[PDB]
Design a protein around this ligand. Structure first.
Ligand SMILES: COc1ccc(NC(C)=O)cc1
Lengths: 254, 300
C-alpha cells in the first residue's frame, strides 16, 4: 500500500522497515556572481535512512565531490540516494535486510524501485505522513559530522539515544517527530528549550539531552507550545482562544 | 483477385473485411467476398447483430490456401475453414460469382490505406503471436489476453506479443539504472531490436498487428502493446533516422484510419502527450503530431 487510510502501528511491528528521506542529499547556497548572474554552491548533504522500531539511523554523508561535473543535480540526487540505499541493503546480512522501504517523497519511488529490481520481495512504499526528517540537520552532532566530512562516509546513530530502555518504539517515534517538527518550525526556540537548563547535559554517545521521565513531559509540553505559538504567528490566529480538540488537530494535522 | 466464399449467413451479423464493413441480415443470400487484393494479409471480422459481445475474426493470406467461412450453430460463430480440394473450391466460387451472391472488396485505385496499415505485417509472423499451427489463418477476438496480461489465463488462446516492461531487469543494466530508465536506447536497440526482433521490420510488424487487433476487435491487451511499442521508441534518445521517419508514417496512417468515435477508448492520453510533447522524439514525428493536433486536439 502507501499510508492513505493509515495504520501507524505497522511502523512498530517486527517486520524490518526503513524510512528513506532524501530532502538533505543535494544542498546548495544560492549567490550572485561577479557579473550579477546567480550561481549555486553545493554543501555536504546526507541520506536519512531510519529504522523506526530500533532507532538505528544509517546517515550516508553525501560529499560535494559527488556533484563535480554532473548535470541535472536535483534529478541525479534521487538516483544517487537510491544507489546508496540499495548498496546499504546489499551490505546487510539477509536477516537484517528490510521487508519494506518507505520513502518520504513520491519522487523517490521510481529511482528506488529500479535500483531494487534484484529484491522483488522488498516493498517500496510512499507515505501520507508529513514527516519532519528534513530537520535532521538541526541536530548539532548530525550537522557537525556532515559539514566536517572530506569524503563519502556512512555514520551510524541511534536517534532514540537510550529511550527504548524506558518507552516503547511508538512513544520514541512520537517524541522524535515532535522534536524534529519543533526544530523545523523554530530551530532557535527548540534548541533553547532543549539546551537552556545548565544542569542537563547530552552524553558523549547521545544526540539529545539526558532528561528524566518527568523532564521529558515538560520538554514535550514546551515543544507542543512552540509549534502552536508558531502556527498562530504564521496564520495570525489568537491561539489563547483555541480548544484542546482544535490544538490537538493542528499538531498531528501537521 | 482472391475470394472467401461463405456457405451461408444464418445469423444477422456485421462483417468486416480489413477497414470496410457491411451488414448481413438473418438468412440473407450472402455467399461472401470477392476481388480481395493479393499481396497483403487480410482480416475478416464479425460482430453479431443479436449480441455485440461476439466480436472475433481471422487473419489470412489467400496466397496460403483456399479459405471459406461457415457458421457453426453449436459454437455459435462464423468459422474459417481451409478447402483442400482446389476444383471444388473453384466450382463453388464460380457459381456464387455468376449468381452475384458476393460483395466486392471495395478498393479505390488511389487508396494505399491497407498497404500503409499492414506494410510490415506477415502471415508467418502473425502465426508466432497467435499459435494454432494446424490452421494457415489466425483467430483473434475482443477477450483474448496477452502473455504479459496473463503474468499480471488459458495459455493456448493467448496473444504472444513481446513483453515490454520499463521496470524489469531486462530493461535496466545493473550499474546503468538512471541511464537506462531515463533513456530507453539500450532496451530498444540492444535488447529488443538486436536481441529479439532482429530488425525494425519485425518490430514495426508487431506494432502494426497490435494496432489492428486493438481497432478491429477492441482488444485491450493489443492496445497496451501498441502504446508500449510507441513509448519504447519515443523514450529512446538514440534511434536510427530511418526508423523515426517510418514510425511517423506508420502512426500517421493509424491515426488517420482510427474512427473518431473510438478515440476515447483506443488512445492513451498519457502516452501520446508524453510521446509528442516531452519525449526525446517530441520533434521527430511531424506528420503524426499534425494529424493528432487536427483530429484529436481534446486528447492533447
Ligand atoms: C554494521 O551494520 C549495522 C547495522 C545497523 C546498525 N545500527 C545502528 C546502531 O545504527 C549498526 C551497524
Amino acid at each position: 500500500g502507501a499510508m492513505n487510510s493509515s495504520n501507524y502501528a505497522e511502523l512498530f511491528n517486527n517486520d524490518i522497515k526503513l524510512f528513506v528521506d532524501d530532502t538533505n542529499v543535494y544542498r546548495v547556497t544560492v549567490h550572485k556572481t561577479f557579473e550579477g548572474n546567480v550561481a549555486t554552491k553545493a554543501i555536504n548533504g546526507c541520506i536519512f535512512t531510519l529504522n523506526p522500531k530500533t532507532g538505528h539511523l544509517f546517515l550516508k554523508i553525501i560529499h560535494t565531490s559527488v556533484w563535480a561535473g554532473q548535470k541535472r543535480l536535483s534529478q541525479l540526487a534521487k538516483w544517487k540516494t537510491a544507489e546508496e540505499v540499495s548498496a546499504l541493503v546489499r551490505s546487510l546480512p539477509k536477516e537484517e535486510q528490510p521487508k519494506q522501504i518507505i520513502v518520504t517523497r513520491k519522487a523517490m519511488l521510481d529511482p528506488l524501485e529500479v535500483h531494487m529490481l534484484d529484491f522483488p520481495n522488498i516493498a517500496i512504499r510512499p507515505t501520507e505522513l508529513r514527516l519532519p526528517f528534513s530537520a535532521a540537520m538541526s541536530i548539532d552532532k548530525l550537522s557537525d559530522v556532515v559539514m566536517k566530512a572530506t569524503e563519502p562516509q556512512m555514520v551510524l546513530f541511534n536517534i532514540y539515544d537510550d529511550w527504548l530502555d524506558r518507552i516503547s518504539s511508538y512513544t520514541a517515534f512520537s517524541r522524535l517527530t515532535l522534536l524534529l517538527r519543533a526544530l523545523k518550525t523554530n530551530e532557535e526556540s527548540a534548541k533553547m528549550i532543549l539546551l537552556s537548563d545548565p544542569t542537563i547535559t547530552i552524553k558523549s554517545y547521545h544526540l539529545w539531552p539526558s532528561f528524566t521521565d518527568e523532564q521529558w513531559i515538560t520538554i514535550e509540553s514546551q515543544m507542543r507550545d512552540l509549534i502552536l505559538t508558531e502556527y498562530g504567528r504564521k496564520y495570525n490566529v489568537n491561539i489563547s482562544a483555541l480548544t484542546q480538540t482544535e490544538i490537538k488537530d493542528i499538531i498531528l494535522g501537521q | 483477385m482472391n475470394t472467401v466464399p461463405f456457405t451461408s449467413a444464418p445469423i444477422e451479423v456485421t462483417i468486416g473485411i480489413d477497414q470496410y464493413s457491411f451488414n448481413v441480415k438473418e438468412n440473407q443470400p450472402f455467399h461472401g467476398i470477392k476481388d480481395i487484393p493479393i499481396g497483403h494479409v487480410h482480416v475478416i471480422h464479425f460482430q453479431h447483430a443479436d449480441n455485440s459481445s461476439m466480436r472475433y475474426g481471422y487473419w489470412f493470406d489467400c496466397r496460403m490456401g483456399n479459405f471459406y467461412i461457415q457458421y457453426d450453430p453449436k459454437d455459435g460463430l462464423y468459422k474459417m475453414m481451409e478447402e483442400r480440394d482446389g476444383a471444388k473450391f473453384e466450382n463453388i466460387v464460380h457459381n456464387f460469382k455468376e449468381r452475384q451472391m458476393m460483395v466486392s472488396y471495395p478498393k479505390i485505385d488511389e487508396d494505399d490505406t491497407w498497404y500503409n496499415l499492414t506494410e510490415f505485417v506477415q502471415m508467418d509472423k502473425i502465426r508466432k503471436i497467435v499459435r494454432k499451427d494446424e490452421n494457415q489463418f489466425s483467430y483473434v477476438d475482443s477477450s483474448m489476453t496477452t502473455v504479459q496480461e496473463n503474468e499480471l489465463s488459458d495459455p493456448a488462446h493467448s496473444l504472444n506479443y513481446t513483453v515490454i516492461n520499463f521496470k524489469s531487469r531486462e530493461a535496466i543494466r545493473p550499474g546503468h539504472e538512471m541511464e537506462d530508465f531515463l533513456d530507453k536506447s539500450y532496451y530498444l536497440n540492444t535488447v529488443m531490436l538486436q536481441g529479439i526482433f532482429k530488425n525494425s521490420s519485425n518490430y514495426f510488424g508487431e506494432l502494426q498487428f497490435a494496432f489492428l487487433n486493438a481497432m478491429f476487435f477492441g482488444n485491450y491487451g493489443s492496445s497496451l502493446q501498441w502504446h508500449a511499442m510507441i513509448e519504447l521508441i519515443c523514450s529512446s534518445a538514440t534511434v536510427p533516422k530511418h526508423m523515426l521517419d517510418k514510425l511517423d508514417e506508420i502512426l500517421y496512417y493509424q491515426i488517420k484510419t482510427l474512427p473518431e468515435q473510438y478515440s476515447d477508448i483506443l488512445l492513451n492520453e498519457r502516452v501520446w502527450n508524453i510521446c509528442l510533447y516531452s519525449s526525446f522524439q517530441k520533434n521527430s514525428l511531424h506528420n503524426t503530431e499534425k494529424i493528432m493536433e487536427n483530429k484529436y486536439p481534446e486528447l492533447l
